[PDB]
Design a protein around this ligand. Structure first.
Ligand SMILES: CCCCCCCCCCCCCCCCCC(=O)OC[C@H](COP(=O)([O-])OCC(O)COP(=O)([O-])OC[C@@H](COC(=O)CCCCCCCCCCCCCCCCC)OC(=O)CCCCCCCCCCCCCCCCC)OC(=O)CCCCCCCCCCCCCCCCC
Ligand SMILES: CCCCCCCCCCCCCCCCCC(=O)OC[C@H](COP(=O)([O-])OCC(O)COP(=O)([O-])OC[C@@H](COC(=O)CCCCCCCCCCCCCCCCC)OC(=O)CCCCCCCCCCCCCCCCC)OC(=O)CCCCCCCCCCCCCCCCC
Ligand SMILES: CCCCCCCCCCCCCCCCCC(=O)OC[C@H](COP(=O)([O-])OCC(O)COP(=O)([O-])OC[C@@H](COC(=O)CCCCCCCCCCCCCCCCC)OC(=O)CCCCCCCCCCCCCCCCC)OC(=O)CCCCCCCCCCCCCCCCC
Ligand SMILES: CCCCCCCCCCCCCCCCCC(=O)OC[C@H](COP(=O)([O-])OCC(O)COP(=O)([O-])OC[C@@H](COC(=O)CCCCCCCCCCCCCCCCC)OC(=O)CCCCCCCCCCCCCCCCC)OC(=O)CCCCCCCCCCCCCCCCC
Ligand SMILES: CCCCCCCCCCCCCCCCCC(=O)OC[C@H](COP(=O)([O-])OCC[N+](C)(C)C)OC(=O)CCCCCCCCCCCCCCCCC
Ligand SMILES: CCCCCCCCCCCCCCCCCC(=O)OC[C@H](COP(=O)([O-])OCC[N+](C)(C)C)OC(=O)CCCCCCCCCCCCCCCCC
Ligand SMILES: CCCCCCCC/C=C/CCCCCCCC(=O)OC[C@H](COP(=O)(O)OCCN)OC(=O)CCCCCCC/C=C/CCCCCCCC
Ligand SMILES: CCCCCCCC/C=C\CCCCCCCC(=O)O[C@H](COC(=O)CCCCCCC/C=C/CCCCCCCC)COP(=O)(O)OCCN
Lengths: 43, 85, 64, 129, 80, 139, 135, 103, 231, 43, 62
């Protein structure tokens, strides 16, 4: 529809804010980010 | 039935038949004749375009190991569902 | 129904493929582009007349 | 049953008044004044003229035959004459076919006794027809 | 008027009533084909393409051709 | 006056078309059917309106012939083909194409038999092609 | 160098067959190059007389082809199947008999879905030959 | 001035049209043509009998059998095929002669 | 198997050669929208958005020469086959789709993921993306199916009605000379009315179907066009 | 268009020349007067 | 597009243009072929084929 402008480096939220299937995969669960498809979709 | 028969091409002139084996072999002979000369090296893109895909497809056919039976492509009768032969 | 058939589909489709690859260029060069050029002619004539009048007007306006 | 009759009469009267032919209007007025029928008078005049022109037709036929036989007709032959002759040929063919059908008094040829179609005649639903 | 889906084109008037009223009509200058010209019947006096060939004659010619087409095999049948 | 055609219109009314300004308007208020100035242009009303121009005998003050220097441009190139020459070429080509199509139409609809007849009295039943020849080792 | 890619490389003179070509173009242009002959996508012209001439001609030649090339096959099949199953058997009949058979086929065509069904369904007790007559 | 449609001859314009104007469409069309002739270019004898004839298959002369007979006769005569070979018959020549004398 | 046959356009080809050896203006186009994609001025597209005009015009001419003239009795629609129409629509639709895909701009497909960030990505947005990707191919299939079915149904109806009219006209006209003549005249008038109505309906429907056929292709093209604003 | 001269003018072409020729004003006046008279008679 | 051309006002005027002359000839053929079929196919001497029950298209298509 309309033109798409890529976000700036400062406009991209941090990875820790993203949520997985059950909950955020923060510290001690970072390596589970690779396996959680929903977390990757949300990211 | 009769109304359905109105929906056919009205200018059919001639029908020719040819076996897949025969014209495939003739095409291969033509391809060999044109790709044989020395002035067309095997590493040229033209030669590989002519040969590689055909080789790959034939290899895929040879490697096939299917648990089901594929009826012959050119049977005399392929309209009977309960007779694959 | 032959419209639902496939036993001579390739030869049947050759009619469309011949129309697309061999007859469309002839219709393109002989019928379509000529008609659209004919449609173009009047507006281009009008605009070029206006451009010539503009040139003459500018020629006159620079005199003093 | 009466309104329809009145409407038809009115329509035909309007159409009769509409025509702008001096001769037709004059004849209609004269016959209306005298109370006679114009159409029947026209028919009688036509038949009288045709009765008096029979030998004119014969003379014209012989003159036309001489004109055709002498070759003068083909000397000035044009495309219009070709069109007329094609029309003439078509009428001749259709008349020959109609004459054959009337002569045998049947649309189709009659079936011979030795033909295998005799059964069809025997198994007619209505022998009267 | 119409003949089936074919409608007779009609020329749009271009003169105003004031200008039109001042026009003097002189049919003596008109062609013989168009005298007492009627928009509802402009071809009433138009000449025939072939003298003596009526529309009914052509219609009947077609009817006779159809009869020949359907009846020729009844008089001159042919074998398979 | 003659019976020849004029600048093509496409069946369009120029008083309501999208390029109407390109067509001059005369005193009567009817836009021309062509880029030229037309005194007797008219509009006819069928299901759709269409503009018509009737050729007529009219005298126009003819400016004298200029010199060839001021209107001739000798920039012709080998690829260039003029519209007159193109019309000639296309006329001849279409004449021959029309004759060929006429012969094809007559043969197709009046002489060519349909293949695979039930009785076998007309048309071919088909046959095999590309059969091997002189290859005993093939069998 | 062998053949030119440009249409300007002429193969004939400008005056070759000028007369016949001009007659052909006169035939084409007289009715088509007119203001009221505005086509719809080049297929439907505006001139009424083009319809009046071309619809009958198209129907006529299509009908001739259908009657003499397409329906003839069905007619011959009916004749062969109903009178012996062989062409020689049909030819053993006379032209009049063949005419009768072909006209009955025409009757069947004209009824089609609305005619009586006794033309192809044998009523019980009918004495005419059945399907196993020639078998 | 130069234009492809007016200056080039028809074959040249055809190549230009399908190479610099509609190359993807030409590619897809060629793809589909290859597919059709690879998978939709065969018809069995039974299919021909069911649907291959305008008025129906004329069993009373069996044109398919005649066509195949001509095909096989031509192949045998041209390729010098010995149809009496044991592989075709499944038995030796002497056994074939014995069968001929028996029947 | 190789069948040799000919199209039913040879007379029309002859007429085209006769009547188009000289130039003529074209002012009426069945699908005019292929020529006017942009309606707001100062908007322009870097994509070749007018590439479809030539194919559209040729397709309209071809389909009109076949479908419109098929109303004449015994005229044959030579291409009337389901899979042949599938091939035609496949060519056009897949060619344009591959033109957009060869662009190698993945952001062009961002709009396939329907919805906003509020909607759950896996259970709502992804399923909508699946359905939309399915809907593109279904649009291709529906286009060709609609074109095939409309022609087939219209001509079946015409054939059946013509057969009925022939039957009653030939085998029941004698009632004009009988005492039940009014019934036959009523039936005959009804048949004439239905005849005219069917012909008008088919004439309108053929052109409408061609319009819709071209509109589907142009809609495919328009779904992926992006317009810049002149400054 | 000399090659068309032999064809002449048909009825429709003659009508167009008559209505749109130098006598166009007279024909227009006559036609409009006749139509007005017929409309008045109809009412 | 049905924009214009010669349009006969009534039957009698069809002979004022060659194209409409051909049209009225064709209309004559069209309408006159029906009476011919009435006469031919409702004839008294028309007889159904005795072997009509030997074979029918209904057998073949079934
Ligand atoms: C199998 C073999 C069998 C063989 C059997 C034997 C064969 C015969 C052998 C000889 C026998 C002895 C001789 C007998 C001769 C009799 C005839 C005779 O002399 O005639 C002269 C006689 C006039 O003589 P006249 O009185 O001295 O005349 C004085 C002037 O000369 C007057 O001059 P004119 O200027 O008036 O000239 C014109 C005049 C003279 O024209 C003629 O001479 C005509 C031709 C004469 C011969 C006719 C023979 C008829 C025999 C039967 C039919 C055979 C086919 C005939 C084909 C004719 C084609 C034109 O025209 C007419 O006569 C017109 C008649 C038709 C009138 C039409 C009006 C219809 C109105 C309907 C309105 C309905 C509204 C309902 C509303 C309801 C609301 C609830 O005319 C007639 O008798 C006319 C008879 C017409 C009968 C037609 C019947 C057709 C079939 C029924 C209709 C079916 C279709 C339509 C149905 C529609 C639904 C309702
Ligand atoms: C400066 C010199 C002055 C000399 C003055 C001389 C004056 C006197 C006259 C001289 C004598 C006459 C000269 C010829 C006149 C021809 C007619 C004419 O005037 O035309 C107008 C025009 C006159 O020339 P121009 O206007 O001055 O210049 C033309 C432009 O420069 C360029 O034109 P364009 O590019 O715009 O268009 C050319 C062409 C487009 O270009 C081509 O078509 C050329 C390429 C075509 C190739 C087709 C074959 C491909 C096969 C596959 C590939 C095979 C590869 C094999 C490899 C090796 C294998 C070992 O356009 C067309 O196709 C449309 C026109 C078609 C004409 C209609 C043809 C049929 C007429 C039938 C009438 C009779 C019916 C039957 C009657 C029966 C009665 C009972 O000529 C042409 O347009 C040329 C047409 C050429 C068509 C060739 C078609 C050949 C088809 C048969 C092939 C047979 C192969 C057999 C192989 C067997 C193997 C077993
Ligand atoms: C001397 C010529 C060059 C010699 C060779 C040179 C060196 C090699 C060149 C490149 C070879 C490519 C190899 C394959 C690459 C991948 C594609 C693929 O899968 O291919 C499958 C298969 C090849 O098989 P393969 O993979 O090599 O291995 C064999 C397998 O065992 C088979 O397994 P299968 O199950 O796939 O087998 C089924 C069947 C499957 O076969 C097919 O599906 C055949 C499809 C043909 C496609 C044609 C493409 C061009 C279309 C142009 C537009 C036409 C529009 C419609 C016109 C209709 C009316 C004519 O395969 C065959 O039997 C192959 C036979 C191929 C014969 C090709 C003959 C072309 C004739 C063109 C006629 C044009 C007439 C225009 C007249 C106009 C006049 C104005 O088909 C093709 O590759 C077809 C395209 C071949 C193009 C060859 C080069 C250009 C054409 C040169 C000859 C021109 C003759 C003109 C005669 C004019 C007479 C008037
Ligand atoms: C064994 C029996 C024989 C058969 C052998 C066959 C071998 C097959 C090999 C295997 C092939 C496998 C694949 C087959 C797939 C088929 C698919 C198919 O049919 O699709 C439907 C599809 C239907 O297309 P369409 O929409 O009908 O349009 C195509 C039409 O051709 C119309 O389209 P168009 O109008 O757009 O075309 C352009 C047209 C533009 O318009 C024109 O040029 C107008 C003319 C049109 C001609 C073409 C139409 C043909 C009409 C029917 C036949 C006409 C009468 C023939 C009379 C025969 C009498 C026995 O220009 C031309 O046609 C250029 C050629 C012009 C020739 C002019 C010759 C003039 C000679 C003058 C001589 C004067 C001598 C004077 C001496 C004086 C001495 C004192 O067909 C095609 O697309 C073409 C399929 C062709 C595939 C290639 C086949 C291989 C080549 C075979 C050539 C055989 C030559 C030897 C025959 C000898 C007699 C027995
Ligand atoms: C009565 C039954 C009715 C059934 C009706 C069923 C529907 C029929 C519909 C027919 C009409 C519509 C057809 C639309 C088109 C369909 C297209 C399609 O599916 O075709 C697929 C088919 C697939 O081909 P294939 O079937 O030969 O696949 C080979 C795969 N093996 C070897 C494993 C068997 O495509 C073709 O037929 C064309 C193949 C040649 C052209 C492409 C060559 C390049 C390939 C690139 C990848 C591989 C090589 C490496 C890269 C390149 C290196 C140089
Ligand atoms: C833009 C809109 C265009 C609308 C055009 C409207 C045309 C109106 C036609 C009125 C009736 C015409 C009757 C013709 C009779 C012919 C003789 C005959 O027997 O026919 C009977 C035939 C069939 O009648 P039938 O079915 O009763 O036949 C009976 C025959 N038996 C019993 C054996 C089965 O009539 C028709 O089929 C006529 C249908 C016409 C429908 C309109 C077609 C329009 C599309 C084609 C346009 C062509 C223009 C080409 C111009 C040049 C192009 C470059
Ligand atoms: C390149 C050939 C090299 C070998 C020598 C072969 C000579 C064979 C004898 C030829 C005698 C007749 C020649 C007639 C004139 C030919 C003129 C010509 O080539 O015109 C091409 C002209 C097309 O013209 P345009 O495309 O418009 O463009 C032309 C200008 N750019 O083609 C035609 O019209 C066809 C003319 C064919 C003539 C015959 C050609 C024969 C060629 C044979 C080569 C093979 C070797 C033969 C050896 C013969 C030994 C006895
Ligand atoms: C040599 C001919 C003489 C002509 C004289 C005709 C006089 C007839 C007067 C009575 C007619 C009505 C009779 C009513 C019953 C008819 C039944 C019927 O169909 O009869 C057929 C005869 O029918 C025909 O062959 C003719 C049918 C109708 C012919 C129509 C004639 C032309 C009509 C032109 C129409 C054009 C438009 C005009 C409109 C005007 C009216 C609205 C024979 O019947 P069977 O032998 O028992 O059955 C055969 C099946 N085994």
């Amino acid at each position: 529809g309309e033109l798409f402008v890529r976000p700036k480096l400062e406009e991209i939220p941090p990875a820790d804010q993203c949520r997985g299937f059950f909950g955020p995969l923060n510290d001690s669960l970072k390596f589970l980010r690779l396996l959680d498809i929903k977390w990757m979709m949300n990211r | 039935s009769n109304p359905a028969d109105h929906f056919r091409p009205n200018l059919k002139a001639l029908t020719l038949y040819a076996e897949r084996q025969h014209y495939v072999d003739r095409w291969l002979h033509v391809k060999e004749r044109w790709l044989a000369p020395w002035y067309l090296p095997w590493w040229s893109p033209l030669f590989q375009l002519g040969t590689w895909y055909s080789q790959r497809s034939r290899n895929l056919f040879l490697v096939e190991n299917h648990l089901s039976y594929r009826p012959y492509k050119f049977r005399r009768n392929d309209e009977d569902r309960n007779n694959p032969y | 129904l032959e419209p639902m058939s496939t036993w001579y589909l390739a030869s049947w489709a050759m009619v469309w493929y011949y129309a697309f690859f061999f007859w469309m260029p002839m219709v393109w060069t002989d019928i379509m582009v000529p008609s659209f050029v004919y449609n173009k002619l009047p507006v281009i004539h009008f605009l070029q007349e206006k451009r010539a009048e503009q040139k003459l007007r500018r020629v006159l306006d620079e005199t003093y | 049953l009466c309104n329809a009759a009145s409407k038809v009469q009115a329509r035909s009267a309007k159409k009769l008044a509409a025509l702008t032919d001096a001769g037709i209007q004059k004849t209609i007025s004269e016959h209306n004044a005298n109370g006679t029928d114009a159409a029947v008078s026209s028919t009688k005049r036509y038949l009288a003229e045709q009765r008096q022109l029979f030998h004119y037709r014969v003379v014209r036929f012989f003159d036309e035959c001489h004109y055709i036989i002498s070759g003068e007709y083909f000397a000035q032959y044009t495309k219009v004459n070709l069109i007329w002759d094609l029309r003439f040929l078509t009428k001749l063919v259709v008349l020959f076919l109609i004459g054959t059908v009337l002569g045998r008094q049947s649309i189709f040829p009659p079936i011979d006794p030795d033909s295998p179609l005799v059964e069809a005649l025997v198994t007619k639903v209505n022998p009267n027809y | 008027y119409n003949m089936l889906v074919f409608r007779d084109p009609k020329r749009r008037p271009q003169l105003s009533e004031e200008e039109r009223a001042k026009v003097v009509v002189n049919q003596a200058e008109w062609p013989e084909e168009f005298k007492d010209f009627d928009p509802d019947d402009p071809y009433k006096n138009s000449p025939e393409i072939i003298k003596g060939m009526s529309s009914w004659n052509l219609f009947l010619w077609g009817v006779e051709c159809a009869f020949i087409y359907q009846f020729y095999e009844l008089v001159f049948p042919k074998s398979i | 006056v003659g019976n020849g055609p004029t600048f093509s219109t496409g069946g369009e009314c120029m008083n309501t078309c999208d390029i109407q300004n390109a067509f001059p308007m005369n005193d009567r208020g009817v836009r021309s059917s062509s880029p030229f100035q037309e005194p007797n242009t008219a509009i006819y009303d069928s299901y759709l309106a269409w503009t018509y121009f009737q050729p007529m005998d009219v005298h126009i003050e003819k400016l004298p012939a200029p010199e060839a220097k001021y209107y001739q441009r000798h920039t012709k190139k080998p690829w260039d083909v003029s519209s007159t020459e193109l019309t000639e070429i296309q006329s001849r080509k279409k004449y021959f194409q029309t004759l060929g199509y006429l012969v094809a139409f007559i043969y197709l609809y009046f002489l060519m038999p349909k293949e695979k007849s039930f009785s076998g009295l007309s048309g071919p039943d088909g046959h095999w092609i590309m059969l091997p020849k002189g290859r005993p080792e093939l069998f | 160098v062998l053949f030119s890619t440009y249409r300007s490389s002429r193969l004939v003179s400008k005056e070759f067959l000028h007369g016949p070509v001009m007659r052909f173009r006169a035939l084409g242009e007289y009715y088509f190059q007119r203001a009221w002959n505005g086509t719809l996508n080049w297929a439907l012209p505006g001139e009424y007389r083009l319809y009046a001439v071309m619809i009958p001609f198209i129907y006529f030649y299509h009908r001739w082809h259908n009657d003499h090339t397409l329906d003839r096959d069905h007619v011959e099949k009916a004749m062969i199947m109903r009178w012996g199953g062989t062409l020689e058997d049909v030819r053993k009949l006379s032209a009049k008999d063949q005419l009768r058979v072909r006209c009955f086929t025409d009757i069947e065509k004209l009824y089609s879905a609305y005619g009586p069904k006794d033309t192809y369904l044998q009523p019980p007790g009918d004495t005419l030959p059945g399907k196993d007559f020639y078998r | 001035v130069y234009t492809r449609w007016k200056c080039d001859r028809l074959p040249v314009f055809q190549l230009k049209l399908f190479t610099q104007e509609y190359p993807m469409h030409a590619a897809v069309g060629i793809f589909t043509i290859i597919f059709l002739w690879k998978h939709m270019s065969h018809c069995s004898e039974e299919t021909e009998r069911k649907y291959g004839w305008w008025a129906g298959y004329p069993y009373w002369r069996d044109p398919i059998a005649r066509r195949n007979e001509t095909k096989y006769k031509q192949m045998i005569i041209n390729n010098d095929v010995d149809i009496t070979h044991p592989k075709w018959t499944g038995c030796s020549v002497e056994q074939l002669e014995e069968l001929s004398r028996v029947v | 198997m190789f069948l040799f046959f000919f199209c039913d356009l040879f007379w029309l080809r002859l007429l085209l050669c006769m009547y188009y050896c000289v130039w003529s203006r074209l002012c009426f186009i069945v699908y005019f929208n292929c020529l006017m994609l942009i309606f707001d001025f100062l908007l322009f597209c870097l994509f070749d958005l007018y590439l479809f005009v030539g194919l559209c015009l040729f397709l309209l001419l071809w389909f009109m020469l076949f479908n419109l003239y098929s109303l004449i009795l015994y005229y044959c629609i030579t291409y009337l086959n389901l899979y042949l129409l599938f091939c035609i629509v496949f060519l056009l639709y897949i060619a344009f789709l591959f033109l957009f895909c060869f662009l190698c701009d993945f952001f062009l497909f961002n709009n396939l993921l329907v919805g906003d960030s509020f909607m759950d990505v896996f259970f709502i947005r992804f399923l909508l993306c699946f359905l939309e990707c399915f809907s593109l191919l279904c649009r291709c299939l529906s286009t060709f199916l609609r074109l095939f079915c409309n022609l087939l149904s219209s001509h079946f109806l015409l054939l059946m009605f013509f057969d009925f009219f022939y039957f009653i006209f030939v085998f029941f006209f004698y009632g004009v000379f009988c005492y039940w003549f009014i019934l036959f005249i009523f039936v005959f008038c009804f048949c004439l009315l239905f005849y005219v109505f069917l012909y008008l309906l088919d004439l309108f429907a053929a052109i409408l179907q061609l319009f819709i056929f071209c509109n589907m292709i142009l809609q495919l093209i328009m779904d992926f066009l992006l317009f810049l604003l002149f400054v | 268009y000399d090659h068309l001269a032999s064809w002449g003018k048909d009825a429709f072409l003659r009508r167009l020349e008559f209505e749109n020729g130098p006598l166009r004003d007279q024909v227009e006046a006559h036609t409009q007067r006749l139509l007005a008279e017929r409309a008045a008679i109809a009412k | 597009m049905l924009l214009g051309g010669f349009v006969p006002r009534r039957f009698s005027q069809f002979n004022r243009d060659p194209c409409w002359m051909f049209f009225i000839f064709s209309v004559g053929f069209w309408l006159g072929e029906y009476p011919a079929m009435m006469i031919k196919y409702n004839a008294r001497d028309l007889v159904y084929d005795p072997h009509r029950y030997v074979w029918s298209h209904h057998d073949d298509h079934h």
